[PDB]
């Protein structure tokens, strides 16, 4: 065993922020921070109108009294809405009570290849947690059912929660996408119930490098050769072979120092392994793995945060 | 026949009233003053001899409120007292004792590749020029910035609301530029330190090339239009093999297709042929594909939408 698992942040601080938002006949989840509740704006749309909503007119049609916000877990509460606004694909509802359990937090956009934790919620109740990597095509391979919209994704730096994702939709191929908290959708997606052009996914090269380092840290290094491929040369190759371009980080550099294996050795290895594992395995796998980040490998195997 | 297309920025007056000079030690740059907050690049704290690998966490802890001098030069001049300081990603959040009386209605958003925004280029807190750029697919912009321009801001405008999307940070080796969003993340994989950085490959923005071909058709230049069509799905496979972004249609593109009667798929086919060479002909005075004008630019400037 590699010692790697899909590891999420503990979810308790975020659980204490989750609420149910109802607007007429629709209901979904919201995030209660300070005096604000964030939720997907399509809670305003009638179920027979999700294909072509005019969110501007829907917002005008609403009053503060049109929204009901309920906290179900912990100490239950019904929150009076005293203001409402739209930002991109999210609603910003102002409530009369500040969440007493508001954690230290920021809003940040997550980048392709980076990992974050998701708290899956239904009717304002947390039901599970998992971690995903933002794919190069700005989808995530998640697990979301009807009623999950408004479920949140986040990272944590120290005690500060960095909210990066609010769930909106499932694509035809079964992957998922949603909004950052500036209200933009990830990728080119729109929050309407129409089939949409979803872009080509790629192998995340930096994460494949991290995984090969995890294998070396486990004493599995049959694929390591003296041969090296430069970052520039690898990146020209990656463009032709459905890999993201490799951008080194201090986290990757720490793996290189610990193992004594240079990044360029693993970039050469990836080019060979992409043509076939030749009947061999790496960490029990016969294919490249890009769902573990350099930070994952440093933390889980080396204890370096 | 001049197309009627120019690089058209928003009037800058609303944003000029928000620019300030921020000085820390012997480093100076520009800041954005909204309500009681001044945003600026965090490398204002870094000594000029330390920019290659700054310890920004240690630098921030060493500062006091008195380390920062904030001055408004244009309009009604003022020297603003800093009463709090914090770091959000690659930006500093300085709290000042007086709210900007000229704060416009505003939001913070992230701009996506191919989208246009306006830039107010500033030096020592003084606006000096305005221009418009499109975010490149490698998350750089083709700007015009010199020493002292950091903290210059980019924005779009929806109605009277200014959507701030960019704070200038650096110039890359190839002469292009990049910066931060106001969540503090750098665009792309870039880091705000003075070191060599991998530059991802740029691509043609297919949606903008399509917009430009519609501009040509609207101007009576339609020799490249044929009955032949390429589907979006087929074009996007071709695009990944030819350094184009994948095409995602929008309502703005659809408006161009309806006005001209030329289907998107006809222009996707045309792009594929034109990319191999214009065969000695010109389109709107050019012998190569143009991707610096958006569907919205064409709708606004040519059809007057
Ligand atoms: C919000 O809770 C919900 C989350 C979804 C539900 C299933 N899994 C999820 O992650 N979001 C939606 O239902 C959104 C709402 C939009 C953004 C206004 N719609 C959505 O995800 O739609 C998916 C696709 C898009 C086209 C479409 O009709 N459709 C639904 C599928 C499901 C049924 C089988 C085929 C169609 C109908
Ligand atoms: C802030 O005012 C300033 C704006 C720059 C100045 C020139 N044009 C701009 O856009 N920003 C900087 O000086 C930053 C500071 C960093 C982020 C701490 N550095 C910067 O822009 O460096 C640019 C230099 C000069 C041109 C160039 O290629 N380059 C990058 C360095 C790094 C590699 C080693 C030498 C070259 C390549």
XYZ file of C-alpha atoms and ligand atoms in Angstrom:
684
model
C 0.000 0.000 0.000
C 1.255 3.457 -1.059
C -0.034 5.170 2.058
C -2.117 7.494 -0.157
C -5.866 7.879 0.282
C -8.351 10.471 -0.932
C -8.049 12.803 2.078
C -10.544 15.602 2.795
C -10.351 18.337 5.374
C -12.450 17.768 8.503
C -15.812 19.299 7.647
C -17.134 20.485 11.033
C -16.381 24.182 10.528
C -18.211 24.179 7.184
C -21.095 22.012 8.458
C -21.936 24.797 10.920
C -22.444 27.201 7.984
C -24.826 25.151 5.865
C -28.466 26.236 5.484
C -31.504 25.433 3.373
C -32.740 28.176 1.033
C -36.273 28.045 -0.361
C -37.681 30.453 -2.928
C -41.254 29.628 -3.829
C -41.383 26.024 -5.030
C -37.613 25.473 -5.280
C -35.158 24.608 -2.521
C -31.427 24.001 -2.315
C -28.445 24.604 -0.019
C -26.808 27.855 1.016
C -23.642 28.962 2.835
C -24.159 31.273 5.820
C -21.136 33.474 6.601
C -21.286 36.667 8.667
C -24.601 38.310 7.606
C -24.604 36.724 4.130
C -26.165 33.568 2.703
C -24.781 32.443 -0.671
C -26.748 30.086 -2.898
C -27.152 29.295 -6.618
C -29.395 31.825 -8.328
C -31.443 29.106 -10.017
C -33.365 28.666 -6.778
C -35.353 31.600 -8.244
C -36.311 29.752 -11.408
C -39.568 27.771 -11.744
C -38.974 24.111 -12.528
C -40.698 24.515 -15.924
C -38.366 27.394 -16.882
C -34.828 26.107 -16.174
C -33.917 25.883 -19.880
C -34.107 29.627 -20.652
C -34.356 31.711 -17.468
C -34.106 35.491 -17.417
C -32.343 35.802 -14.088
C -32.405 39.618 -14.188
C -36.220 39.687 -14.377
C -36.531 36.861 -11.849
C -34.436 38.899 -9.407
C -36.603 42.006 -9.918
C -39.686 39.870 -9.232
C -38.337 38.845 -5.821
C -38.581 40.600 -2.473
C -36.797 39.845 0.789
C -39.945 37.989 1.872
C -39.606 35.665 -1.162
C -36.723 33.797 0.476
C -36.827 31.430 3.443
C -33.511 30.430 5.038
C -33.397 27.641 7.608
C -30.555 26.179 9.647
C -31.432 22.593 10.570
C -28.369 21.150 12.262
C -26.903 22.251 15.560
C -28.996 25.011 17.038
C -31.811 25.401 14.490
C -32.740 28.836 13.232
C -34.934 30.595 10.704
C -33.059 33.571 9.297
C -34.880 36.730 8.260
C -33.703 37.991 4.862
C -33.268 41.779 4.859
C -31.581 42.219 1.477
C -31.013 40.263 -1.722
C -28.567 40.670 -4.589
C -27.213 38.727 -7.548
C -23.523 38.227 -8.237
C -22.966 36.272 -11.413
C -24.545 32.853 -10.936
C -24.973 33.210 -7.141
C -27.485 34.972 -4.951
C -26.190 37.038 -2.021
C -28.927 37.140 0.634
C -28.365 39.446 3.585
C -29.778 38.101 6.855
C -30.438 39.883 10.150
C -28.212 37.564 12.259
C -24.504 36.991 11.766
C -23.551 33.331 11.862
C -21.986 32.873 15.331
C -20.021 29.909 13.937
C -18.460 31.845 11.045
C -14.898 30.559 10.597
C -11.957 32.574 9.421
C -12.416 32.415 5.671
C -11.512 33.742 2.249
C -12.882 33.236 -1.244
C -10.470 31.873 -3.859
C -10.697 30.318 -7.320
C -9.183 26.846 -7.615
C -6.967 25.977 -10.575
C -6.836 22.849 -12.762
C -4.948 20.059 -11.029
C -5.517 21.500 -7.567
C -7.471 19.463 -5.005
C -10.302 20.630 -2.797
C -12.765 19.166 -0.306
C -16.515 19.073 -0.966
C -19.280 18.940 1.643
C -22.262 17.323 -0.085
C -25.527 18.665 1.315
C -29.225 18.012 0.761
C -32.017 20.232 2.126
C -29.430 22.066 4.209
C -28.139 18.893 5.874
C -24.569 17.687 5.263
C -24.531 14.093 4.114
C -20.993 13.330 2.997
C -17.576 14.660 2.199
C -15.060 13.821 -0.503
C -12.142 15.442 -2.307
C -11.722 16.089 -6.047
C -9.179 17.689 -8.361
C -10.372 20.487 -10.636
C -9.973 18.925 -14.083
C -8.196 20.787 -16.912
C -11.622 21.208 -18.579
C -13.014 22.901 -15.418
C -15.190 19.978 -14.347
C -14.883 17.775 -11.276
C -15.531 14.043 -11.014
C -17.926 14.315 -8.099
C -20.910 12.561 -6.566
C -23.990 14.786 -6.604
C -27.699 14.015 -6.853
C -30.829 16.111 -7.224
C -30.951 18.585 -4.353
C -27.170 18.913 -3.962
C -26.876 22.373 -5.540
C -25.309 24.819 -3.137
C -22.985 22.139 -1.747
C -19.626 23.791 -1.201
C -16.003 23.030 -1.965
C -13.088 24.462 -0.004
C -9.441 24.298 0.949
C -7.900 25.137 4.304
C -4.743 27.115 5.086
C -4.117 26.984 8.805
C -7.455 27.796 10.400
C -8.631 29.829 7.381
C -11.192 28.142 5.152
C -10.812 29.101 1.487
C -14.197 28.597 -0.167
C -13.709 27.886 -3.863
C -16.747 26.025 -5.233
C -20.548 26.115 -5.057
C -22.221 23.202 -6.848
C -24.506 23.924 -9.832
C -24.863 21.168 -12.392
C -24.082 17.735 -13.809
C -22.763 17.437 -17.370
C -23.811 14.770 -19.869
C -20.626 12.772 -19.249
C -21.411 12.527 -15.522
C -18.920 15.126 -14.343
C -19.913 18.237 -12.420
C -19.321 21.950 -12.304
C -20.298 25.006 -10.367
C -19.411 28.540 -9.407
C -16.628 30.354 -7.670
C -17.780 32.815 -5.043
C -17.216 35.774 -7.350
C -20.196 34.212 -9.128
C -18.387 33.030 -12.247
C -18.959 29.516 -13.469
C -15.831 27.442 -13.804
C -14.926 26.998 -17.469
C -17.295 28.159 -20.200
C -20.412 26.671 -18.567
C -23.742 28.431 -18.024
C -26.292 27.807 -15.262
C -29.153 26.827 -17.532
C -30.710 23.407 -18.119
C -29.418 22.892 -21.652
C -26.899 20.396 -22.992
C -23.553 22.175 -23.277
C -20.267 21.849 -25.141
C -17.880 20.345 -22.585
C -14.184 20.678 -23.376
C -11.521 18.002 -23.652
C -9.971 16.707 -20.450
C -6.221 16.179 -20.125
C -3.779 14.381 -17.884
C -2.482 16.766 -15.206
C 1.271 16.450 -15.662
C 2.317 17.940 -12.307
C 0.059 15.446 -10.510
C 1.421 12.512 -12.500
C 4.914 13.638 -11.455
C 3.740 13.789 -7.823
C 2.386 10.224 -8.077
C 5.635 8.882 -9.565
C 7.457 10.492 -6.626
C 5.005 8.788 -4.258
C 5.958 5.503 -5.897
C 9.675 6.219 -5.415
C 9.007 7.166 -1.782
C 7.458 3.701 -1.476
C 10.577 2.030 -2.937
C 8.979 1.532 -6.380
C 11.363 3.043 -8.937
C 11.709 0.568 -11.828
C 10.625 3.323 -14.248
C 13.421 5.709 -13.201
C 16.278 5.918 -15.715
C 19.202 8.333 -16.059
C 17.482 9.773 -19.140
C 15.985 13.239 -18.783
C 13.500 15.375 -20.682
C 13.665 19.129 -20.162
C 10.569 20.994 -19.017
C 10.451 22.949 -22.307
C 10.772 19.787 -24.393
C 8.220 17.942 -22.264
C 5.792 20.840 -22.635
C 6.015 20.803 -26.431
C 5.360 17.064 -26.211
C 2.480 17.555 -23.783
C 0.628 19.834 -26.216
C 0.556 16.999 -28.755
C -0.335 14.210 -26.324
C -3.256 15.506 -24.190
C -1.156 16.414 -21.145
C -1.235 19.758 -19.385
C 2.001 21.691 -19.523
C 4.233 21.075 -16.517
C 4.892 24.010 -14.180
C 7.215 23.199 -11.308
C 6.482 24.268 -7.736
C 8.314 24.276 -4.436
C 6.155 21.279 -3.455
C 7.481 19.282 -6.401
C 11.015 20.465 -5.629
C 10.727 19.054 -2.098
C 9.879 15.632 -3.559
C 12.887 15.870 -5.889
C 15.243 16.617 -2.988
C 13.854 13.862 -0.732
C 14.116 11.182 -3.439
C 17.208 12.366 -5.265
C 15.314 11.923 -8.551
C 15.155 14.985 -10.810
C 11.882 16.280 -12.279
C 13.344 15.810 -15.761
C 13.858 12.088 -15.075
C 10.158 11.695 -14.311
C 9.146 13.798 -17.312
C 11.097 11.334 -19.469
C 9.437 8.471 -17.575
C 5.950 9.861 -18.279
C 6.664 9.986 -22.022
C 7.616 6.284 -21.953
C 4.842 5.179 -19.579
C 2.201 6.906 -21.737
C 3.101 4.445 -24.533
C 2.375 1.505 -22.220
C 3.381 0.025 -18.861
C 4.794 -3.046 -20.660
C 2.905 -5.418 -18.385
C 4.215 -3.748 -15.223
C 2.448 -1.808 -12.495
C 3.154 1.306 -10.449
C 1.535 1.459 -7.003
C -0.913 -1.229 -8.096
C -1.920 0.679 -11.233
C -1.408 -0.013 -14.942
C -2.260 3.571 -15.948
C -1.006 7.021 -15.042
C -2.647 8.560 -11.966
C -3.208 12.314 -11.817
C -5.665 12.605 -8.918
C -2.966 13.203 -6.243
C -1.205 16.552 -5.962
C 2.378 17.273 -4.911
C 0.937 18.695 -1.697
C -0.971 15.425 -1.123
C 2.237 13.408 -1.451
C 4.278 15.736 0.771
C 1.621 15.768 3.505
C 0.484 12.158 3.482
C 3.849 10.439 3.048
C 6.328 12.976 4.419
C 4.194 14.854 6.949
C 5.128 18.190 5.330
C 2.227 20.669 5.223
C -13.753 49.780 -46.392
C -12.693 50.335 -42.768
C -14.498 47.727 -40.666
C -15.667 50.182 -38.033
C -13.777 48.143 -35.403
C -11.410 49.838 -32.949
C -9.928 48.786 -29.612
C -12.612 50.392 -27.435
C -12.081 50.838 -23.677
C -14.617 51.966 -21.124
C -14.452 55.643 -20.116
C -11.940 55.584 -17.279
C -13.221 58.436 -15.095
C -14.938 56.276 -12.487
C -11.764 54.219 -11.948
C -9.331 57.170 -12.055
C -11.098 58.449 -8.924
C -10.089 55.205 -7.145
C -6.321 55.158 -7.881
C -3.782 55.962 -5.172
C -0.041 55.733 -4.686
C 1.167 53.177 -2.118
C 4.685 53.461 -0.735
C 6.412 51.018 1.609
C 10.016 51.868 2.413
C 11.708 52.718 -0.887
C 9.207 50.738 -2.993
C 6.236 52.516 -4.549
C 3.420 51.364 -6.834
C -0.313 51.938 -7.352
C -3.310 50.930 -5.280
C -7.081 50.746 -5.713
C -9.110 52.595 -3.063
C -12.672 51.291 -2.580
C -14.720 52.096 0.551
C -12.172 51.913 3.445
C -9.860 49.461 1.664
C -6.782 49.978 -0.519
C -5.730 46.970 -2.663
C -2.168 46.758 -3.944
C 0.403 44.126 -4.945
C 2.107 42.648 -1.915
C 5.570 42.977 -3.456
C 5.474 46.639 -2.429
C 6.755 45.241 0.884
C 9.758 43.522 -0.684
C 13.208 45.165 -0.809
C 14.507 45.485 -4.366
C 17.368 43.100 -3.503
C 14.929 40.422 -2.284
C 12.368 40.132 -5.112
C 13.652 36.766 -6.390
C 12.366 34.748 -3.381
C 10.399 36.940 -0.957
C 9.213 35.621 2.387
C 5.916 37.480 2.177
C 4.576 36.004 5.437
C 7.619 37.302 7.335
C 7.500 40.633 5.505
C 3.842 41.182 6.457
C 4.454 40.378 10.126
C 7.330 42.882 10.223
C 5.149 45.713 8.918
C 3.047 48.080 10.969
C 0.287 50.378 9.773
C 2.938 53.117 9.765
C 4.998 51.204 7.172
C 2.541 52.230 4.422
C 2.041 55.677 2.918
C -1.090 56.044 0.782
C -1.662 59.215 -1.207
C -4.416 60.322 -3.549
C -2.894 62.773 -6.055
C -5.503 63.540 -8.708
C -8.769 65.319 -8.017
C -9.071 66.304 -4.356
C -5.653 65.272 -3.002
C -5.324 63.489 0.325
C -2.868 61.515 2.444
C -4.763 58.530 3.853
C -3.970 57.044 7.264
C -3.600 53.247 7.257
C -5.401 51.704 10.245
C -5.059 48.027 9.359
C -3.144 45.765 6.986
C -3.658 42.195 5.785
C -2.528 39.981 2.930
C -4.888 38.120 0.597
C -2.919 35.902 -1.763
C -0.677 38.158 -3.865
C -2.465 41.340 -2.778
C -2.344 43.570 0.268
C -5.598 44.766 1.825
C -4.845 48.045 3.570
C -7.615 49.510 5.712
C -7.715 53.323 5.708
C -9.625 55.636 8.025
C -11.725 57.368 5.325
C -14.018 55.683 2.823
C -13.454 56.715 -0.787
C -16.263 59.223 -1.457
C -15.984 58.357 -5.170
C -16.384 54.592 -4.723
C -18.461 53.351 -7.674
C -20.830 50.447 -7.538
C -18.480 47.512 -8.022
C -17.848 43.790 -7.899
C -14.789 41.559 -8.132
C -14.755 38.945 -10.851
C -12.287 36.789 -12.725
C -11.970 37.269 -16.450
C -11.741 34.266 -18.757
C -9.477 33.660 -21.762
C -10.742 35.470 -24.846
C -12.736 38.027 -22.847
C -11.876 41.716 -23.204
C -11.314 44.193 -20.421
C -10.167 47.778 -19.976
C -6.904 48.708 -18.256
C -6.058 51.993 -16.537
C -2.268 52.228 -16.660
C -0.974 54.240 -13.699
C 2.398 55.460 -12.409
C 2.991 56.839 -8.887
C -0.749 56.877 -8.279
C -1.478 58.934 -11.415
C -3.485 57.516 -14.353
C -1.508 57.892 -17.556
C -3.231 55.797 -20.196
C -6.073 53.469 -20.968
C -6.205 50.515 -23.324
C -8.131 47.284 -23.798
C -6.850 43.726 -23.993
C -8.199 40.208 -24.253
C -7.113 37.636 -21.694
C -4.932 35.209 -23.636
C -5.500 31.435 -23.333
C -2.176 31.193 -21.426
C -3.452 33.789 -18.905
C -1.208 36.606 -20.061
C -2.213 39.879 -21.648
C -0.470 41.816 -24.400
C -0.231 45.057 -22.479
C 1.909 48.156 -22.252
C 3.473 48.446 -18.798
C 6.747 49.875 -17.531
C 8.500 50.010 -14.184
C 6.140 51.474 -11.607
C 2.928 50.275 -13.279
C 2.139 47.529 -10.766
C -1.248 47.984 -9.174
C -2.694 49.276 -12.440
C -6.156 47.754 -12.690
C -8.288 46.080 -15.306
C -12.059 46.034 -15.269
C -15.266 45.640 -17.228
C -18.505 47.579 -16.716
C -22.050 46.188 -16.645
C -24.400 49.139 -16.490
C -23.000 51.460 -13.844
C -21.295 48.592 -11.962
C -17.525 48.295 -12.376
C -16.352 44.670 -12.365
C -12.705 44.714 -11.239
C -10.847 41.727 -12.665
C -7.103 42.446 -12.811
C -4.279 44.022 -10.796
C -1.023 44.304 -12.704
C 1.979 42.422 -11.279
C 4.659 41.486 -13.785
C 6.101 41.256 -17.268
C 7.071 37.894 -18.741
C 10.169 37.175 -20.809
C 8.279 37.346 -24.118
C 6.990 40.861 -23.347
C 3.482 39.830 -22.268
C 2.024 40.681 -18.858
C 0.131 39.112 -16.003
C -1.438 40.000 -12.699
C -3.830 39.006 -9.948
C -7.537 38.790 -9.544
C -8.916 40.483 -6.467
C -9.278 37.157 -4.659
C -5.484 37.405 -4.605
C -4.834 34.553 -7.011
C -2.446 35.106 -9.879
C -3.889 34.396 -13.300
C -2.485 31.195 -14.728
C 0.302 29.292 -12.977
C 2.313 32.439 -12.282
C 3.929 33.475 -9.010
C 4.771 37.022 -7.931
C 8.507 36.589 -7.626
C 11.380 37.761 -9.804
C 12.456 34.413 -11.246
C 12.210 32.549 -14.531
C 8.732 31.107 -14.961
C 7.374 28.537 -17.379
C 5.198 30.309 -19.932
C 2.354 28.206 -21.260
C 1.726 28.158 -25.000
C -0.651 30.795 -26.366
C -3.435 29.823 -28.771
C -5.836 31.457 -31.187
C -9.166 32.279 -29.512
C -11.609 30.568 -31.851
C -14.730 32.387 -30.617
C -13.022 35.710 -31.303
C -11.846 34.612 -34.749
C -15.467 33.695 -35.488
C -16.562 37.129 -34.262
C -14.025 38.785 -36.574
C -15.234 36.765 -39.573
C -18.785 37.910 -38.767
C -17.470 41.496 -38.684
C -16.061 40.941 -42.178
C -19.379 39.549 -43.427
C -21.260 42.492 -41.877
C -18.904 44.750 -43.862
C -19.623 42.977 -47.152
C -16.413 40.885 -47.043
C -17.667 37.316 -47.401
C -15.535 35.661 -50.101
C -14.452 32.982 -47.587
C -18.019 31.770 -46.901
C -18.978 28.441 -48.480
C -21.900 26.032 -48.069
C -19.458 23.684 -46.308
C -19.803 23.317 -42.557
C -17.738 21.905 -39.706
C -19.552 20.823 -36.563
C -18.529 22.287 -33.236
C -17.489 18.796 -32.083
C -15.329 18.202 -35.164
C -13.853 21.705 -35.078
C -12.865 21.289 -31.454
C -10.921 18.090 -32.202
C -9.178 20.017 -34.996
C -8.564 22.958 -32.655
C -6.638 20.833 -30.131
C -4.411 19.737 -33.023
C -3.866 23.261 -34.383
C -3.232 25.623 -31.406
C -6.792 26.975 -31.259
C -9.014 27.141 -28.219
C -12.084 24.965 -28.324
C -15.137 26.855 -29.533
C -18.052 27.427 -27.165
C -20.949 29.332 -28.685
C -22.760 32.096 -26.832
C -25.845 34.253 -27.290
C -23.562 37.013 -28.600
C -22.230 34.765 -31.383
C -25.770 33.588 -32.163
C -26.884 37.198 -32.653
C -24.148 37.601 -35.275
C -25.232 34.402 -37.027
C -28.852 35.550 -37.169
C -27.998 39.036 -38.463
C -25.741 37.794 -41.273
C -27.538 34.525 -41.998
C -24.172 32.713 -41.889
C -24.086 29.691 -39.599
C -21.362 29.264 -36.992
C -20.426 25.936 -38.558
C -19.764 27.640 -41.900
C -17.210 29.899 -40.220
C -15.664 26.978 -38.328
C -15.076 25.367 -41.720
C -13.697 28.650 -43.082
C -11.262 28.997 -40.167
C -9.821 25.551 -40.894
C -9.110 26.496 -44.511
C -7.979 30.070 -43.820
C -5.516 28.845 -41.183
C -3.540 27.066 -43.923
C -3.150 30.416 -45.712
C -5.219 33.244 -47.196
C -4.130 32.282 -50.733
C -3.007 35.853 -51.405
C -6.333 37.415 -50.393
C -7.154 39.709 -47.474
C -9.909 39.867 -44.866
C -10.629 43.350 -43.486
C -7.142 44.375 -44.572
C -5.386 41.429 -42.876
C -3.584 38.374 -44.234
C -3.937 36.433 -40.972
C -6.680 35.490 -38.541
C -7.551 38.106 -35.923
C -8.648 37.051 -32.445
C -8.451 40.326 -30.481
C -12.105 41.344 -31.053
C -14.923 39.648 -29.161
C -18.459 38.753 -30.251
C -19.612 41.549 -27.946
C -17.233 44.034 -29.622
C -18.754 43.208 -33.013
C -22.346 43.364 -31.719
C -21.738 46.742 -30.046
C -19.456 48.490 -32.524
C -20.970 47.263 -35.809
C -24.610 46.361 -35.156
C -24.997 48.985 -32.430
C -26.397 46.616 -29.792
C -28.928 21.176 -8.335
O -29.255 20.460 -7.149
C -28.735 20.244 -9.519
C -27.548 19.305 -9.303
C -27.557 18.143 -10.297
C -28.764 17.214 -10.164
C -28.231 15.886 -10.672
N -26.816 15.957 -10.330
C -26.375 17.198 -10.139
O -25.206 17.532 -9.879
N -28.535 21.028 -10.740
C -29.352 20.944 -11.799
O -30.310 20.170 -11.846
C -29.025 21.846 -12.990
C -29.831 23.141 -12.942
C -29.429 24.173 -13.989
C -27.984 24.598 -13.773
C -30.352 25.378 -13.948
N -29.256 21.165 -14.249
C -28.507 20.109 -14.615
O -27.574 19.661 -13.975
O -28.915 19.625 -15.806
C -28.176 18.484 -16.313
C -28.614 18.220 -17.746
C -28.441 19.448 -18.645
C -29.493 19.253 -19.712
C -30.593 18.524 -18.989
O -31.771 18.433 -19.333
N -30.058 17.934 -17.893
C -30.776 17.075 -16.947
C -30.792 15.605 -17.355
C -31.359 14.703 -16.234
C -32.541 13.982 -16.914
C -31.909 13.085 -17.946
C -31.477 13.849 -18.927
C -31.731 15.282 -18.562
C -33.061 15.095 -17.823
C 5.660 46.470 -11.087
O 5.596 47.868 -11.337
C 6.496 45.734 -12.124
C 5.869 45.810 -13.517
C 6.835 45.325 -14.602
C 8.045 46.247 -14.765
C 8.357 46.176 -16.250
N 7.064 45.861 -16.841
C 6.206 45.310 -15.988
O 5.080 44.863 -16.268
N 6.634 44.329 -11.737
C 7.827 43.750 -11.556
O 8.898 44.348 -11.702
C 7.821 42.265 -11.193
C 8.036 42.079 -9.692
C 7.911 40.646 -9.196
C 6.517 40.126 -9.495
C 8.200 40.559 -7.706
N 8.853 41.615 -11.977
C 8.836 41.727 -13.317
O 7.925 42.202 -13.967
O 9.955 41.217 -13.866
C 10.048 41.398 -15.302
C 11.467 41.063 -15.728
C 12.018 42.050 -16.759
C 11.532 41.494 -18.074
C 11.528 40.009 -17.833
O 11.550 39.125 -18.687
N 11.456 39.800 -16.494
C 11.355 38.501 -15.822
C 12.691 38.000 -15.283
C 12.558 36.621 -14.597
C 13.506 35.723 -15.412
C 14.875 36.238 -15.072
C 15.034 37.395 -15.676
C 13.760 37.735 -16.390
C 13.357 36.317 -16.813
